[PDB]
Amino acid sequence: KAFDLVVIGAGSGGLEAGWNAATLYGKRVAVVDVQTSHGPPFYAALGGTCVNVGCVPKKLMVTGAQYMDHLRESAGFGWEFDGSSVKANWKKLIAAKNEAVLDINKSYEGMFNDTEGLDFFLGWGSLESKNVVVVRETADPKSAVKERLQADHILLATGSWPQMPAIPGIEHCISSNEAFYLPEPPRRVLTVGGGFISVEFAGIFNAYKPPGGKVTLCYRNNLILRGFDETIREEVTKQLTANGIEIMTNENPAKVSLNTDGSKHVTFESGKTLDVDVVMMAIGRIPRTNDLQLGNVGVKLTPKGGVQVDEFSRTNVPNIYAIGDITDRLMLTPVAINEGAALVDTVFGNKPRKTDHTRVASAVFSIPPIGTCGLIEEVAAKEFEKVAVYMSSFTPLMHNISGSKYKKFVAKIVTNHSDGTVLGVHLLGDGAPEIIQAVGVCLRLNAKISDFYNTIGVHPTSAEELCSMRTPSYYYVKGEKMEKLP
Amino acid sequence: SHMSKAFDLVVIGAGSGGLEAGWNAATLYGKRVAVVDVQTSHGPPFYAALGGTCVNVGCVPKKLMVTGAQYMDHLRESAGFGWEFDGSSVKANWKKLIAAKNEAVLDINKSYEGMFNDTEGLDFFLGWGSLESKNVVVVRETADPKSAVKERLQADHILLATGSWPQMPAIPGIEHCISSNEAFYLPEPPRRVLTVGGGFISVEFAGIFNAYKPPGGKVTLCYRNNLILRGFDETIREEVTKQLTANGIEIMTNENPAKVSLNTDGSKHVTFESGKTLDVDVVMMAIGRIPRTNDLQLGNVGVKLTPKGGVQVDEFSRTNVPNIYAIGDITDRLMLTPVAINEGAALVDTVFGNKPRKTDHTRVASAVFSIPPIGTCGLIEEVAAKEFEKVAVYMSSFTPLMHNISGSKYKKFVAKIVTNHSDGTVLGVHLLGDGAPEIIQAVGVCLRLNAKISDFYNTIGVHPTSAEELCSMRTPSYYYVKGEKMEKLP
Ligand SMILES: Cc1cc2nc3c(=O)[nH]c(=O)nc-3n(C[C@H](O)[C@H](O)[C@H](O)COP(=O)(O)OP(=O)(O)OC[C@H]3O[C@@H](n4cnc5c(N)ncnc54)[C@H](O)[C@@H]3O)c2cc1C
Numbered sequence A: 001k002a003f004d005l006v007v008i009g010a011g012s013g014g015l016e017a018g019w020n021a022a023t024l025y026g027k028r029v030a031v032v033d034v035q036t037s038h039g040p041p042f043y044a045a046l047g048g049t050c051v052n053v054g055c056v057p058k059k060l061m062v063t064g065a066q067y068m069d070h071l072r073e074s075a076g077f078g079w080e081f082d083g084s085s086v087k088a089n090w091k092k093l094i095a096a097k098n099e100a101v102l103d104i105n106k107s108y109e110g111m112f113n114d115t116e117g118l119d120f121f122l123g124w125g126s127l128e129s130k131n132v133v134v135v136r137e138t139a140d141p142k143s144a145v146k147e148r149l150q151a152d153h154i155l156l157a158t159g160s161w162p163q164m165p166a167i168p169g170i171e172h173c174i175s176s177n178e179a180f181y182l183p184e185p186p187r188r189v190l191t192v193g194g195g196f197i198s199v200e201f202a203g204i205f206n207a208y209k210p211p212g213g214k215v216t217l218c219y220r221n222n223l224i225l226r227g228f229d230e231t232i233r234e235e236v237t238k239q240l241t242a243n244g245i246e247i248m249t250n251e252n253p254a255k256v257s258l259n260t261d262g263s264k265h266v267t268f269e270s271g272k273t274l275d276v277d278v279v280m281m282a283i284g285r286i287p288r289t290n291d292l293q294l295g296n297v298g299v300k301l302t303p304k305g306g307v308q309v310d311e312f313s314r315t316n317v318p319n320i321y322a323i324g325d326i327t328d329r330l331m332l333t334p335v336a337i338n339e340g341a342a343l344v345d346t347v348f349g350n351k352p353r354k355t356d357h358t359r360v361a362s363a364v365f366s367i368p369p370i371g372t373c374g375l376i377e378e379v380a381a382k383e384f385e386k387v388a389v390y391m392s393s394f395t396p397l398m399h400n401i402s403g404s405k406y407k408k409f410v411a412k413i414v415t416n417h418s419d420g421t422v423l424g425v426h427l428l429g430d431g432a433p434e435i436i437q438a439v440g441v442c443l444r445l446n447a448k449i450s451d452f453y454n455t456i457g458v459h460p461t462s463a464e465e466l467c468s469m470r471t472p473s474y475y476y477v478k479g480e481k482m483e484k485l486p
Numbered sequence B: 001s002h003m004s005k006a007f008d009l010v011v012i013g014a015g016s017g018g019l020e021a022g023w024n025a026a027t028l029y030g031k032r033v034a035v036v037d038v039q040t041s042h043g044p045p046f047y048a049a050l051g052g053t054c055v056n057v058g059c060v061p062k063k064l065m066v067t068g069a070q071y072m073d074h075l076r077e078s079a080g081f082g083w084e085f086d087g088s089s090v091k092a093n094w095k096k097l098i099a100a101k102n103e104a105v106l107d108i109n110k111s112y113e114g115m116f117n118d119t120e121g122l123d124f125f126l127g128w129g130s131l132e133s134k135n136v137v138v139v140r141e142t143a144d145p146k147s148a149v150k151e152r153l154q155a156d157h158i159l160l161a162t163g164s165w166p167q168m169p170a171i172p173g174i175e176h177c178i179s180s181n182e183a184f185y186l187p188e189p190p191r192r193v194l195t196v197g198g199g200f201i202s203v204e205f206a207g208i209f210n211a212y213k214p215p216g217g218k219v220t221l222c223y224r225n226n227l228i229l230r231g232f233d234e235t236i237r238e239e240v241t242k243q244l245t246a247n248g249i250e251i252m253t254n255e256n257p258a259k260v261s262l263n264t265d266g267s268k269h270v271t272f273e274s275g276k277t278l279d280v281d282v283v284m285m286a287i288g289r290i291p292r293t294n295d296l297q298l299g300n301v302g303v304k305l306t307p308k309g310g311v312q313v314d315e316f317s318r319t320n321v322p323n324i325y326a327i328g329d330i331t332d333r334l335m336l337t338p339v340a341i342n343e344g345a346a347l348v349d350t351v352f353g354n355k356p357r358k359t360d361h362t363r364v365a366s367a368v369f370s371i372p373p374i375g376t377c378g379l380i381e382e383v384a385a386k387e388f389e390k391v392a393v394y395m396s397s398f399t400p401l402m403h404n405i406s407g408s409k410y411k412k413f414v415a416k417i418v419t420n421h422s423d424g425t426v427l428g429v430h431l432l433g434d435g436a437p438e439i440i441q442a443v444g445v446c447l448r449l450n451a452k453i454s455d456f457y458n459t460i461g462v463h464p465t466s467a468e469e470l471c472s473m474r475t476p477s478y479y480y481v482k483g484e485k486m487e488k489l490p
């Protein structure tokens, strides 16, 4: 059966590509995925990682965790109730999450059913040849063939997978995938990694932990959230500690063993040990390239393991493309969507378009959260002669009342001081992810720091702090930090 | 004999506008400044004080009281996410809220008092300022112009920044009603309250009273016209009406109190023009705010008022008297803190900085702290449709996923973008939902940079957020062509 486009992976990127090809350009599209709905055994499914074991369920679980702060903080505003009666039912959270995600799974299934030139196939897709995608029962290339899809065009969009370090007892550890389906909230949990997944789950586990519970986050280096603003990395560390999460920096598991009670004994490279109910490895995500049989057609990988692509998502093989996490670039849903749309406009429209990977807004659903767009000051300082940093920092008046006085709002703007051009905006505090979206738009209009400070504020908000910073706090000259210009 | 003091600038009103002007004049340009206000700290008898209406009896305390009110929703919405506690034990303690708000406001009052005691060429004078002549401001003990003179301040330049005051309708029993001013000091939360008005102050207080009412309590909002929140997007007006109703607030539209008497039990018996009646414990009038011009004795120097009652100003805040200026609510235009601040800063840069500058009153971001709130910047579609031959409206609306779990399914998110369809210029952005006031701030920057719809949709979304809806709208929902609403272009 003959298709213009075969997409392997019904995920953020694959679905955007497929939808657009069918509905905008009247093409015949086949999309393959390994499951129709979320969860064990394969976790991702129709909708992708984001829908099934990613942005969507984690956001709903962070919403859940936020109530731990809201219930306590309400007292300062005169709310009275029996604090001793308060309990966090993990099972109810997971059932509510499960229902929300399943509803999205069914809605996407109806999308395929109701849309011309857009067909779903269940199974494991791989490259037989330049123009043939084979769908099998399992990831085993020896398993029963279900379909052979002849394709003018093949889109690789299989996403990424949790990286598990090669330490003794790694089989006793879980990933984010299993975290979504834990029957019980872990009493003691170690989250391994300093990235957004580790931090976000440390917050989820911290709110739902049974009495006497303890969330520990470890990270092999000095400071969590490498690649984020340094002030914010230091402040989110403080804010996680203030909420009872134990941060172990410069620590890395060397091995994990089974205790007689079913708990885990973690030995660090330092020789420290910790007993936990759960060890969640969140050290990274690697391109999902192994099941695709890329060596059947010679699709080239980078040394890092990504499918190598040019700016238009083309592989070394004509009519084979790769978008989203499999290209091991920015591992974000909206980037995967943008690449898919760009690809389909390039190949099927008269409109060659390439995704802009600069000035992409992103968020960490820490409590409170991070919103960021564009360069951090140390990356700016290597690119530009004169960088100005503007910094506003304060305890929200509401947290003087709530008692959460540790909850510092941070707003930083990084400029090219030569012309005023905003290079980066970095926010920590309630609403930060919401504030930053339209900042993303501002950086596409070559917004200068004067464009922010000449805009009239919305009062009272956190966001108005962006329109109130007129004088640099400090500068980088030829890459060196200093309070005054040299 | 006590001598008058001489200043480059005398500001009447230590509020949002006046303090910005005063600070900038003294600290940026080395001018000698006097600022006059009637009270050093918030509350009765004059309510506004050092810091202005926003600090004392406006934005600051209302926002802290709305934050308090939001916990009614959080406590209930927590259960869907697995939170369990004794619902029967839940009590909203208004006295705690009011005491917390009072200490937050007093701390701002004290810090402003300190700025004044500490900053050279920036002096605070306690009392009632009025114009005696072109170059003399008199500070009196009261608003009565026969009250004792405390100071005469000679001024090269005079700034009128005395703000506004609640409007009270001339109805029988008006003395049985309060304004927002008294609302902030009620010793007890009212069991039954009528908020009169369809504006943001009525809507915002309705939400506050609704969360803190005792058992059996009821909040009623009345408005003389068909739909609350004139000036806001019509979809949002309709939806915030449904969301107030869904949270147990009674909305009486096309209804207006004709009189108020006291029942024998001391409760308020309200009779509407329709002959409908309602018994409440509190009637809060929030029908408008009027410029505070009466006490300035403007007739002494001939400062012209508009028909409407505001001080008349040109684009540079200049009155008809060359060295007398007016900014903020006294000009009776956009009654917003950050617009008063912008005007004050522009005035001082123009008068003392020799870099002339006028406030842009277009594309001003603003919010309503309804639950959930409104964030808006720029033109509503029916206004755009009168100025532009071809208007496109982009619209996203849905029940946030989190509210399918919370149970608050009535909490529909609305994002609307209004464009000149001719060139794609964004005229207006209108948001209803959690974070809308935070979202809209940088949208203000976008409109100042003449953003087009394609600037929005080429921007990559932050996922998952409400705000990414602004960046996923590629096709108009409908149009206006020569003022006519239609789903498709001809
Ligand atoms: C815990 C977690 C939280 C995240 N939070 C966020 C967030 O808040 N915001 C954000 O922007 N991003 C977030 N991400 C990242 C985001 O999920 C990914 O960047 C995005 O899903 C990648 O889209 P994609 O199209 O590359 O692939 P995916 O969405 O991963 O889709 C790949 C699909 O391919 C299927 N598949 C794999 N191999 C085969 C095969 N051989 N044949 C058929 N089908 C196959 C899989 O089942 C899967 O459905 C998160 C990720 C995780 C793990």
Ligand SMILES: Cc1cc2nc3c(=O)[nH]c(=O)nc-3n(C[C@H](O)[C@H](O)[C@H](O)COP(=O)(O)OP(=O)(O)OC[C@H]3O[C@@H](n4cnc5c(N)ncnc54)[C@H](O)[C@@H]3O)c2cc1C
Pocket (backbone or CB within 6 Å): A459, A460, B012, B013, B014, B015, B016, B017, B018, B036, B037, B038, B039, B046, B048, B049, B050, B051, B052, B053, B054, B055, B057, B058, B059, B060, B062, B127, B128, B129, B130, B161, B162, B163, B164, B180, B201, B292, B295, B296, B327, B328, B329, B330, B334, B335, B336, B337, B338, B340
């Ligand atoms: C309930 C409420 C909620 C509000 N919420 C918001 C909001 O969320 N966001 C927002 O932007 N705006 C809000 N506002 C509006 C905001 O408060 C005003 O727009 C702003 O304060 C006006 O600034 P101003 O400089 O014109 O005057 P003000 O800030 O009102 O200052 C005027 C000052 O003059 C003093 N004064 C008056 N007469 C004399 C005299 N003769 N001599 C000496 N001193 C005198 C007064 O005591 C007062 O302190 C709210 C207003 C109210 C009432």
Ligand SMILES: [C]N1([C][C][C]C2=[C][C]=[C][C]=[C]2)[C][C]N(C(=O)N([C]C2=[C][C]=C(C(=O)[N][C][C]C3=[C][C]=C(F)[C]=[C]3)O2)C2=[C][C]=C(F)[C]=[C]2)[C][C]1
Pocket (backbone or CB within 6 Å): A394, A395, A396, A397, A398, A460, A461, A462, B019, B020, B023, B055, B059, B060, B061, B063, B064, B108, B115
């Ligand atoms: C300015 N000032 C003064 C001093 C000096 C001067 C004067 C005049 C002019 C100029 C200068 C003021 C301001 N600032 C700050 O800090 N600031 C900042 C901050 C802090 C905290 C905060 C918060 O929370 N935010 C969020 C939002 C909101 C607000 C409020 C409320 F109630 C709720 C919510 O925020 C402020 C203050 C106060 C207010 F009311 C607001 C804001 C600074 C200082």
Ligand SMILES: [C]N1([C][C][C]C2=[C][C]=[C][C]=[C]2)[C][C]N(C(=O)N([C]C2=[C][C]=C(C(=O)[N][C][C]C3=[C][C]=C(F)[C]=[C]3)O2)C2=[C][C]=C(F)[C]=[C]2)[C][C]1
Pocket (backbone or CB within 6 Å): A051, A055, A056, A057, A059, A060, A104, A107, A108, A110, A111, B398, B399, B400, B401, B402, B464, B465, B466
């Ligand atoms: C694009 N898409 C895809 C395709 C599909 C289809 C089509 C057609 C037919 C059928 C199917 C996606 C998007 N959309 C919508 O709507 N949307 C919109 C909405 C709804 C709801 C919401 C919310 O809540 N928001 C806020 C933020 C968030 C999110 C999520 C979560 F969990 C949290 C938070 O948001 C969506 C859905 C889902 C998701 F996950 C997200 C979002 C659309 C669609």
